[PDB]
Every structure is written in C-alpha cells, then in structure tokens.
Amino acid sequence: MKSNVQNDCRVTNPATGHLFDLTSLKRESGYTITDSHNRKIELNVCAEAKSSCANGAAVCITDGPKTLNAGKLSKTLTYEDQVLKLVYEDGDPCPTDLKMKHKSYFSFVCKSDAGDDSQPVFLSFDEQTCTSYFSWHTSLACEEEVPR
C-alpha cells in the first residue's frame, strides 16, 4: 500500500509475492513506545523523526528530555525469517563500545489485529553490545498469516 512515501521504503519479497511497505504506517511525527526502563522510545517506522529526536534520527531513545540517537533513518527494508527487518544503525556511540555504533534491529512482524493501531513491543535492548531489537506488529510488514 502507500500512505506517506518517503522516497520509497518498500520491498517486494520474492518469497512471499507481497510488497512490504512501511509507507502506510509512517507519519511525519513518529511513533511512540516505552523503553526497557522509564525511557520513551520515540522512533519512526521507516522515516525520520519530527520531534522524537531531531531530524535524521529514525530511532531515538528518549531518556527523560535526553534524546539518545539509536539509529539514523534507514528506509531500507530487508527480509529475513518471514519478518521485515530494518537496520537502524549509525547512532550515538555508547560508552560500552565506542568503537562501533548503536545497532538497532527492528523486526516488523505481521499480526492479524496488530494491537491498538499497529503497536510495537521492545523485544530486547542490550546496552552490553549496544544493540536494540524491537518487534512491531503491523499488517504491511509481512504476510505469512493474514494480518488484514
């Protein structure tokens, strides 16, 4: 489908035959959830954040009033294990490992109901390796089951 098309942000998975887009779910501001502890995960499904961080940060972990860039805008969709994968990397280097950047893997998984307007869950945030894994339940993500 296509609601807000930031350039593209779509991949046709040859294994499914369905085109996965995240244009339908993206909105200019961003989406909101809560982090592992207190913090607000303010990220956009495949676009840049409006107020969630600043501009080019797609995934930003808002600790109070302090925005932690978890990953830059990566509107590149990949497919793996029947789940839609977007890798939002290139962010604020953590004190745990300064020699690499924050690796935030977002897994977009299709669910028939998808919750209260395609809601995500923080899967695991591993500051130990400065990675973040989140799972978003959305109908545009994949199609192993009918999420419509």
UniProtKB/TrEMBL annotation:
Annotated disulfide bonds: 9-46, 53-60, 94-130, 110-142
Localization per Swiss-Prot or TrEMBL: Endomembrane system
Domain MRH: 7-144
Highest taxon, organism lineage: Eukaryota
Protein name (database record): Cation-independent mannose-6-phosphate receptor
Protein's organism: Gallus gallus
Species classification: Eukaryota, Metazoa, Chordata, Craniata, Vertebrata
Portion of the full sequence shown: 1485 to 1630 of 2470
